[PDB]
Every structure is written in structure tokens, then in C-alpha cells.
Amino acid sequence: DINELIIGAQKHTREVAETQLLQWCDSDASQVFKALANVALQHEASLESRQFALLSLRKLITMYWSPGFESNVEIDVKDFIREVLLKLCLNDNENTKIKNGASYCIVQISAVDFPDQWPQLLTVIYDAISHQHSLNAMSLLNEIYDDVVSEEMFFEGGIGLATMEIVFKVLNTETSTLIAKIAALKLLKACLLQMSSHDEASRKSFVSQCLATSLQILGQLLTLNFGNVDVISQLKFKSIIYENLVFIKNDFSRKHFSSELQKQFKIMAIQDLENVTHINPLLETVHDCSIYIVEFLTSVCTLQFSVEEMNKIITSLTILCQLSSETREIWTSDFNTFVSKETGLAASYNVRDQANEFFTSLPNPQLSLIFKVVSNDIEHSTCNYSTLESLLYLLQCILLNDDEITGENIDQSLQILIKTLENILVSQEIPELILARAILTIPRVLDKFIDALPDIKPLTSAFLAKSLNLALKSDKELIKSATLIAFTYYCYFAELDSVLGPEVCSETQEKVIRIINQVSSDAEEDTNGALMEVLSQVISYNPPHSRKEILQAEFHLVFTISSEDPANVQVVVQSQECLEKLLDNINMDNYKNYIELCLPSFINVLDSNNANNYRYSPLLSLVLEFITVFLKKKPNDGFLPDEINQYLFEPLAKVLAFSTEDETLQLATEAFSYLIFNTDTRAMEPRLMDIMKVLERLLSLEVSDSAAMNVGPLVVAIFTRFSKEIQPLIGRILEAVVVRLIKTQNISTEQNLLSVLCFLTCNDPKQTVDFLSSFQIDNTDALTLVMRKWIEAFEVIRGEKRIKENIVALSNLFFLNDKRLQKVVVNGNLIPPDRYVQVPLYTKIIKLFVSELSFQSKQPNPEQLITTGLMDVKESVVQLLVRFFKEVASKDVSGFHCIYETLSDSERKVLSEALL
């Protein structure tokens, strides 16, 4: 049965069984496992079937073992399955796919079962390591550690001390294999991690002693000198030692790593940086090893470095930071790879990155002195085109140290260094990657040394002009891109409109604009975002004295690049600022030309997106934001020109008539409302019947609750600008708001719509009560249902502006003294499936107002932060309430004398105190 039952499942024939069999276990699981387990136990099997048996087992377990998070199996078959798993996994002689397979099941069982359902799991593993010499048990312990050794088991449970003494025993034995010392060192790091997440007093003796023993053992370990016997394991040995050293130095206080211990390891580490580079797949074994050596030197880089120690370091990093020929070819074959790296947007982390962390960490006794060490090495290497890029990059790291560089004859050095960088860009047969590094390194020289170059103004203008000049007559987009990037490094420290001429600055705008236009045709994602950033800095330097064409070129770039990568986060952010700087502080006459330059592109995107039913589309969302940025840049004095309305209206309307996507509806709603609120009324006059159909549909059930909640400001806009002609359509606005409001049960959405209702009752309280007291909803008049829902919402409202607009609205209903309102009843008190004493609307309004006024005049809580809605109300809630009560008291409004005698004494004191 079961063996050839999966001979198939391990391609119609696979699923015959893979659900065939899943069936079985749900029927009887306890001895489909035992059957599955039994096949893994049997050495009489294709390592393939055994291996899949274990990994088929593997997935299986986390279902029926013990929920678990996605579930039936008997208690003594699991004891069997754990013991079979320990047999396979802890035996070094077994096949390393059986071991890992068995190790996978064990690690999942442990997660569910360990504390109380596998008590000896660790004592077995510890005994396997120390008395059965199991190497794989060390590996299982290491994968188990994170997820099953808790903080508490580590320290009081004795697991941390048991581990550390095992670790120490392997590393102090001259006869444990280097492979076993690696396993011990990886356990050591696991232990350091558990000790890094700490505070309780009884632990501090344990931690202090494990750190001290660790530091002495790692010192003796770094003095072994194997042969060429296995250098990939040799280098994985060294890198895990230096990784542990880094971790001790960085996550424990300095009493635990004395500066003299630091000085020993600094020396061993500088030596091993030399050893590792003078042997040198293998290269990323030695490259990744040297990352940890350098990481440690970074971590003790406040120590002093003998001059000779620094030349050692610089010659080793010069070799290590040289670009591999694979990476040179990737960069020269797709320049977007080079942009991705140099803009920091690459996921890589290599020796060059770690060197940058070293050089930008140096304090200033050492930082200035490496400066000439590298500056000499650059002079003694101007024709070695195998080390010069790397040396320039080390220079770049040093210059990125935020600290200043000064020393005995550093001005000498600089005039020398300045005077080989200009020969890089004049030199005509210079390799592409080295020219780019020189281009990107020049601004950082001029930035770091600006206070020590009297010629800084013409120096920069020439260096920059030379670089645009290469870039435009180089065919290499990598060189162009290095220049675009370098241009931003010049802006960082230099205000170009003053350091250059008004005329030259204007001509370097045109020159990076067309460099951008050359790179853009071939640009992928990270480098489109960098083009947008460059463009916005170009836009910054726009001249008052207008220039028709350069503006048109900038916006064309903004729009086409954004159409290329509308989901890239930098494109989205930088293009909106680009647009905000173009229409920043612009007059009405220029506005009229921007309308023709800008809007027809935006309407194309919206036109195209109807094909897609205005479903979510990142360029749609981005172009709607462009539109809103355009509208809101109109001169404060004036209306939107009439052209804006006739360009934008039925495009935006269509979006709102068909889209069902919350972000699209919300961005279009606010653009549309704003267009209605800010164009002349006679321009908008024929559109109102259409604005209504938009509004009715945004309250229909075709759109979500949160789409209904954007309607507020559209209602405002059509009253605020169709005041005369809205009056015969108020009844439809109201029916729309009302049928929606009663169909929703989300309290927050009710409030949003009640807000619109508050606006509508204030505008005409009678017509509201009339409509609502003639309009029928499910057999009864709306009046009762709405008012009850209104009151229930008012009771849990929040926000000063919301409270006021409801107070004003309901105050207007009270002052109606309406025959019909007086007769409706809302819910008062719970009576002991549930019931409530029925309360007249009117006296419930009084009751609620007195409670608000009681709470609101118990004056503030001492501490605070300092010193929405559709209607603007200036009075405090307290002022609104006292002015209301004073007036209904003064004239017996709507039976107030009756209501007021039904009030309690408590309520009644509140009333006459506030009215004192």
C-alpha cells in the first residue's frame, strides 16, 4: 500500500495520491504517521522516498499534531515518531538529507510540544553533543535555540550555562575539527544574542564570566595557523570569530571589553585583513569574511592606528573594494544597476558598503591622517587602472565623514589631489567606471574642503561645466547618470544661481534637462525616481524673468516619467513637488498658459482609464493628485478661469459616475467639489442637473460607506454657488441623504451623513421636517426613524465641531415648535428582548443639552496640549447652550415650561446656575 502509494506522489499521477492520501490521515491519522515514519526509519529505501517521506511527514505534522494554527493522532505513536526522528537526526553517519528532513520535523514538533510534551528534548540533544560526539546535534541545537530556548530557560533553566560549557569545551580542544569549531562558534553567537536581550541581578555574574571566557578563547582561536588544508572553512572560521567579537564589543558595556583587549584584536584583525587579501566559488567567501574583519575595526575605530597599520588597512581595502569583473559587466551592461547602487537603493551589502561604514566612523585624529595615506596612494597610482577606481571610492568614503579634515600639509595634498581629478576628465582614454567615480567624487572634495579653497567659486563652475560637457557628448548612459547624480551633489553645498552666472545657471538648466531626456528613454525603476529628484532641483533654479520653453520641457519630463513609474514611491513624491514648484506663486496670465500646457495630458490619463472602469490605477491616482495640485494653485485673488471647468468637468464627473474604488472616488470627489466651489456661477449654471446625478450616485449603494462620507463638501459647494437655483432640488438632496442614512449601521458613517443633514436642516428647518414627515420608508414615516437615529448618534458623538453643528441643527428643530416633531418619541431608560421608556423628542433634546452643559462648564483639566464638520460656528459649546436656554426660558419656546417642570432638581440646578 503506502510505499507505492506515494511512488506516484513523489503529473496527473501525483495528485491521484496527494489528495488521495490526505484523505487517509483525516480518517485514521495515528497509523498513517506510523506508516510514514516507518518508511523513513527503513534504510531499505530510495533516499528519495525516505526524504520525501520525512518532508511529506514534515508538512503533515503541523496539522494533526496539536493545534497549532491549521489543523487526531494518538499519544504513543508520537513518542514513537519523536524517537524515530531523534534516531535519524542525531546520527552523523546518516544521509545529510535524512538528517535535515528529520531535523525539520523535530524543529516543528518542538515549537508546539516543547515545554511539557517533550521534556527531555534538550537533555537528549546535550547528551548527543557531549557524549555521542554528534556534530549534527550542535546544528539542531542551533536551529532550535531562537524559537524554543526562552529567556527564562536560558538563565534560570540552566540551558544557557549548559550550552556555554559545551561551546567552550569544543573550542578549548585541539582535536575538535574546525568544522566543529564553526558549529560551536555559531552556538556562541546564539548565546550572545540571548544574553543581549538582558537585567536581573543573579544573571550578571554569569554574563560577565561568559564574556570574559569568550574573549580569551577567541583570542587563542585567532592564533591558530592551519595549512592550505581547507581555506573556505578557514575563512568561515575567522569570519564567525570576528562576528562574535563585533557583537561583544557592540552590545555589552566596556567593562566587558577592555581597551587593551581591543588593541590586541585590532592588531590580529589588521593582520587577518592582510592574510585574507593576499590569498585572493571562493571570492565571496573571502569578501564576506573581510566584511566582518572590517566591521570589527569599525567597532574599535576610536583607537589610534600606527601610521603603518593604516597603510596596511588602505592597501587591503584597495584590493577588497576593487570591482569584480562580474559587477563591472553588470554595471556597463545595464546602467540602471549602477544607479541603483550609487543612490543607496540597492539591496546589496558588500565590502565597499562596509568600508564606507569604517571611514565615516573615524574620529578626527585618524580620519585626517588616512586622508593623505589614501591621497598619496592615489598619486602613486594615476596610471594603474586596476586599483584607481577603488582608491577613489575609498577617498569618497573618507570625504563622507561629516567631520573636517585638517593637518600639517593638507593644502599641499589637496592642490595635488584637485590636480589629478581634472586630469581624469580631460584624459581621453579613461575607463568608463573610473571616469564616473571621479565625476561623483569631485563634488565631495569641493564640499569637504570648501573652507580651504579660495578659488572655490570658479573651481566648482568649471568642474561642473566640464562634467555636463562630457556627459552630453558621451554615448554612455552610465556616465550621463553619474553626472546627473553628481549634479545633485553640487547643489547640496553650492547655491548655483549665485556661484554661476544667471546666464550660465540658466544654461546648465538646459544642459541637465537634455541629459535627463537622454537617460529617460532607457531608465528603470530606481533611476526614474532619481531623474525626478534631479528635475525638481532644476525646477528650483527656475527664474520672475520668464522663459517659455524650459518650463514646457520640465513639465513634459515630469509627466512622461510619472507615466513610466507611477507606483514608484520617489516618482510619486518628487513629481508632486515638481508640480508644486512650477505653479508656485504664479499669476493669472501664466495660469492661462499652464492650462493648455498641463490639463490635456491629465485628461488623456482619465480618458484612458475608463477602459479599465476607473478601477485602481496608480497613474489615475497620481493624475488626480496632479489635478488637485493644479486647482489649488490658482491665485488667491480670483476664480478658476472658465477653461478649467470645461476641460475638467465631464472627465471628473465620469470618474465619479463609474468608479467604485475608494481612493479614486475620494481624490476625484475633492477635485470636483473644489472645481464647483471655485468657478463662476454662470459658468457652472448648466451643469447643476449633472452635479446632482453625481451626488445621488455617490450616496447610492453602488459605492461604499467611506465613499458616501466624501459627499459633505460637495453638498456645501452646490449650496454655496447654486443658492438661487438649488431650492427646487433640495428635496432630492434630502431624499438621497436620508435613504442612505437609515440604510447604514456604521456609527461613524452615520455621523458623516448626519453632518450633511445638520447642514440641510439649518438651511431650511421646515422643508426638512415637511419632506421627512411626508417621505415614506418601509411603511412608516421617516420622521420617527431619522430622529431616533439622530438622537442615538448625538449621544456618542466626538469632536467640538461635530457637537456644535448638531447643537445648532437640533436647536433649530426645537424652535420650530412643530406639531409633528413634538409627537415623536425616542428611547430613554433601559427597563428591566430589551425595552425603554419612551421620551418626547423635545424633552430629550433639553435633557441632552443640560447634560452637555453640566459637563462642559465644569471648567478644564489643568494640563493640556496648547497654551471636523461642514458648518462654521464660533461660539463655544457652552455659549451655544446658554444662549439657547436663555431664549427658550425667556419666551416659553415649544412648551418649555412643561418640559422644565418634568426635569429633575439636578438638571434644573444646572439650568439656572448657567443662566445666572
From Swiss-Prot:
Record-given protein name: Importin subunit beta-5
One GO BP: NLS-bearing protein import into nucleus
Role of this protein: Required for nuclear protein import and mediates docking of import substrate to distinct nucleoporins. Serves a receptor for nuclear localization signals. Mediates the nuclear import of TATA-binding protein (TBP) and of histones H2A and H2B.
One of the record's GO cellular component terms: nucleus
Annotated source species: Saccharomyces cerevisiae (strain ATCC 204508 / S288c)
Subunit structure: Interacts with NAP1.
Pfam families: HEAT_IPO9_c (PF25018), IBN_N (PF03810)
PANTHER family, alphabetized: IMPORTIN-7, 8, 11, IMPORTIN-9
Gene3D superfamilies (UniProt xref): Leucine-rich Repeat Variant (1.25.10.10)
Swiss-Prot/TrEMBL keywords: Acetylation, Cytoplasm, mRNA transport, Nuclear pore complex, Nucleus, Protein transport, Translocation, Transport
Any one Gene Ontology molecular-function term assigned to this protein's record: small GTPase binding
Keyword Signal set for record: no
Record family assignment: Belongs to the importin beta family.
